Amino acid sequence: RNNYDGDTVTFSPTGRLFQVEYALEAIKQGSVTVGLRSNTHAVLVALKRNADELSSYQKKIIKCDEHMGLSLAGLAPDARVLSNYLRQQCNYSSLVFNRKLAVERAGHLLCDKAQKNTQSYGGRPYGVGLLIIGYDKSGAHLLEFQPSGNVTELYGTAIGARSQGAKTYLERTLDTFIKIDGNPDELIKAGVEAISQSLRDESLTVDNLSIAIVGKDTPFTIYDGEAVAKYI
Amino acid sequence: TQQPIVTGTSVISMKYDNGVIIAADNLGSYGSLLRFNGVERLIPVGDNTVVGISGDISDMQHIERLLKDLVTENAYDNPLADAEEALEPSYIFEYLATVMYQRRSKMNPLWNAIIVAGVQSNGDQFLRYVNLLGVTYSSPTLATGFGAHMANPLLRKVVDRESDIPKTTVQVAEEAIVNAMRVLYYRDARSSRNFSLAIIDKNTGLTFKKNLQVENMKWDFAKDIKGYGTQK
């Protein structure tokens, strides 16, 4: 019961709120992404989904700043907002502090952003999961942002539909991709494998793969179409 | 629109091969009255920077508080901060550059001349000017206030340009700042005998020397001056 799920200002007797778990479910309902990283590079590989085959996909990678960027999973209306604010914080750091904003602190402001609508009546916890990758002073990072606002520094994680199979690919091979350095291609190879296990009833196309990379001397670059046909 | 009530005068600084010197007399002159003794211009910030502040002691205090909250700001939300996203002179300078301008735009000028001297964690010598007109410039040698007119030429012998930095050493630079002080003591009214001198090196770390006294004292030529121009 569950008469309690209609307000986000009401708790359950089981010590939950219902709206926040439901916002968690909303991620799964959307597309799929796998993040993983190495000490000198960070990579997101994400599946683009289209409405029909005259439809030409949905851009799943939003470039944040030239040292950070993120992927989305779940509802898009939600993603556009969260992204905007995050970009705003990276541009603020660059102007006022002459810094490339740390991935850890940036992820932490997002956790604080999520709680602003959770507490207050009206608004909602956001219904999108974000995987943020970046390269700062302390080298490569991959953060997993959640609806709740729980932020988790990981070597590899995957969110979205049937993402448990990517974590199984990543878990087996955990120590192997940490040891890769200096070779972006090989982190992409690992990512391409990963996102294969996630799929059901599909096969990778030159326009399903969208591969996003940031590292030491490489700025953030999003590969699309004819730049993902070296790793198809 | 503030006007200076009590003011510090002169901070001198120079570049040398393995780090920098910043130095200044210790005085809070209430105009013609030498009001306050033991006022300390040089504030260590982080541990790789000393920011020296001349101008309104009233604005100085306020800047001191903002500087202390910048150190505290870096600790917050960082697993560590002593080399991860450690506080550089440059970050501090940029944080100050923005606020002096912002205040200038509201027409309540923080009435100061500020030199930020430090060393980066990248091995790079940093030495830069900001003031209450919100004017910024980077230069190998700096000086503020009276000391711009007076003492800065003298240091410009020691280093004219940025290819005589490797041929200037720490004993020699130290020698030049103290002769620069001697001269400020003689020929400037709002300059005291008292002075502090800090050496930030990227290898030796911070040395803060307090309560040095001007020496190499010339007054023994004074008995041969008789009259104003004509008098036996």
A105 lies within 8 A of chain B by CB? yes
Residue of A nearest to B121 (CA): A137
The nearest CA of chain A is from the CA of B97 a distance in Å of 8
Name the closest residue on chain B to residue A104, using Cα atoms. B78
Retrieve residue B20's tokens: 């920098």
**A172-184 burial, b if ≥16 CB within 10 A, otherwise e?**
eeeeebeebbeeb
* Cα–Cα distance list, B59 to A194, B24, B106, B183 (Å): 58, 17, 15, 27
Q: Which residues of B touch A151 (CB under 8 A)?
A: none
Per-residue buried b or exposed e for B144-171, using 16+ beta carbons within 10 Å of the residue's own CB: bbbbeebbbebbeebbeeeeebeebebe
Cα separation, B196 vs A74, in Å, equals: 60
Q: Which residues on chain A are in Cβ contact (under 8 Å) with B94?
A: 96-98
Any A CB within 8 A of B122 CB = no
Whether residue B94 and residue A97 make contact (CB cut-off 8 A), yes or no, is: yes
Q: How far is CA B66 from CA B46, B99, B224, in A?
A: 13, 10, 52
Q: Do A98 and B90 touch (CB under 8 A)?
A: yes
Angle at the Cα of B167 (from B165 to B171), degrees rounded to 5?
Answer: 95
Query: Which among A95, A99, A137 is the nearest to B84, CB-wise?
Result: A137
Tokens 């735009």 sit on residue: B105
**A99: contact with B, CB 8 A cutoff:** yes
Residues of A within 8 A of B98 (CB-CB) are: 95-96
B1 is catalytic: yes
DSSP string computed for B76-94? TT-S--SSSS---HHHHHH
- Give the method of determination: cryo-EM
Q: What is the resolution of this structure in A?
A: 4.5
State the Cα torsion B200-B201-B207-B208 to the nearest 10°.
Answer: -10
Nearest CA in chain B to A99: B91
Sheet bearing A221-223, strands edge to edge: A156-159, A33-37, A41-47, A209-215, A221-223
Question: Residue A203: helix, strand or coil by DSSP?
Answer: coil
| Strands B136-138 and B125-131, sheet pairing | antiparallel
- Taking the CB of residue A22, how many other CB atoms lie within 10 A of it? 15
Nearest by CB to B77, from A98, A99, A105: name it. A105
Which stretches within chain B are classed as H helix? 57-75, 89-104, 146-150, 152-158, 170-187
CB-neighbour burial class of residue A129 (10 A; exposed 0-12, middle 13-18, buried 19+)? buried
Q: Which residue of B has its CA nearest to A105?
A: B77
Give which of B148, B187, B193, B155 is closest to B174, Cα–Cα.
Answer: B155
Burial (CB count within 10 angstroms: exposed 0-12, middle 13-18, buried 19+), residue B106: exposed
- Answer whether B79 touches A (CB < 8 Å): yes
The minimum CA-CA distance between B189 and chain A, rounded to whole Å, is 37
Residues ≥6 apart with Cβ < 8 Å to B50:
B22, B42, B43, B44, B117, B118, B198, B200, B206, B208
Q: Which of B78, B85, B98 sits opposite A96 (nearest CB)?
A: B98
